[PDB]
């Protein structure tokens, strides 16, 4: 298992514009298009993302390409953020994947907001950090995904995904 297969399990793949859990227009493997309510603002963003007129639908290849870019952005965002980088540096390979996942879903800003949990992860206090991470809107709104990520941080293995 690796970050790509992990995110593919969590986000799934859809080839036609859909609404995410928050109700925002998305496509492919969790690629957010706009927080705007307009399906048209959605289609325009999509065409700009793909480089072509698409009318709401993309191919598998186009989806995976947006996916590669988004994972790359996720990592670069962490490496550039003063709060996230030290945490990431401090973790093993599996747990690193778990932080990437959170960033992919909620953005650098959001994750950066979990100050206490981040301090706990840096300190390697696994159980305490798992407990703190669960007291969040994140855990409340997407509990099954949140549990999977959390378990990854607690254990440092891929078991929740196997
Ligand atoms: Cl893009
Ligand atoms: Cl969920």
UniProtKB/Swiss-Prot annotation:
Record-level GO BP terms: cell wall macromolecule catabolic process; defense response to bacterium; peptidoglycan catabolic process; viral release from host cell by cytolysis
Catalysed reaction, written as an equation: Hydrolysis of (1->4)-beta-linkages between N-acetylmuramic acid and N-acetyl-D-glucosamine residues in a peptidoglycan and between N-acetyl-D-glucosamine residues in chitodextrins
Keywords, comma-separated and alphabetical: Antimicrobial, Bacteriolytic enzyme, Cytolysis, Glycosidase, Host cell lysis by virus, Host cytoplasm, Hydrolase, Viral release from host cell
Function comment: Endolysin with lysozyme activity that degrades host peptidoglycans and participates with the holin and spanin proteins in the sequential events which lead to the programmed host cell lysis releasing the mature viral particles. Once the holin has permeabilized the host cell membrane, the endolysin can reach the periplasm and break down the peptidoglycan layer.
Induction field: Expressed late in the viral replication.
Family: Belongs to the glycosyl hydrolase 24 family.
GO MF assignments: lysozyme activity
EC number: 3.2.1.17
pH dependence: Optimum pH is 7.3.
Protein known as: Endolysin
Annotated PANTHER family: T4-TYPE LYSOZYME 1-RELATED
Active-site annotation: 11 (proton donor/acceptor), 20 (proton donor/acceptor)
Binding, substrate: 32, 104, 117, 132
GO cellular component: host cell cytoplasm
One Pfam family per UniProt: Phage_lysozyme
């Amino acid at each position: 298992m690796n970050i790509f297969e992990m995110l593919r399990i969590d986000e799934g793949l859809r080839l036609k514009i859909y609404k995410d859990t928050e109700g925002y227009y998305t496509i492919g493997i969790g690629h957010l298009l706009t927080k705007s309510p307009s399906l048209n603002a959605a289609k325009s963003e999509l065409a700009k993302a793909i480089g072509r007129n698409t009318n709401g639908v993309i191919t598998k290849d186009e989806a995976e390409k947006l996916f590669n870019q988004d994972v790359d952005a996720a990592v670069r965002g962490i490496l550039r953020n003063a709060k996230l980088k030290p945490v990431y540096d401090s973790l093993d390979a599996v747990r690193r994947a778990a932080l990437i996942n959170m960033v992919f879903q909620m953005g650098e800003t959001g994750v950066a907001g979990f100050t206490n949990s981040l301090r706990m992860l840096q300190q390697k206090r696994w159980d305490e950090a798992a407990v703190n991470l669960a007291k969040s809107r994140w855990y409340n709104q997407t509990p099954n995904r949140a549990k999977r990520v959390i378990t990854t941080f607690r254990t440092g293995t891929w078991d929740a995904y196997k």
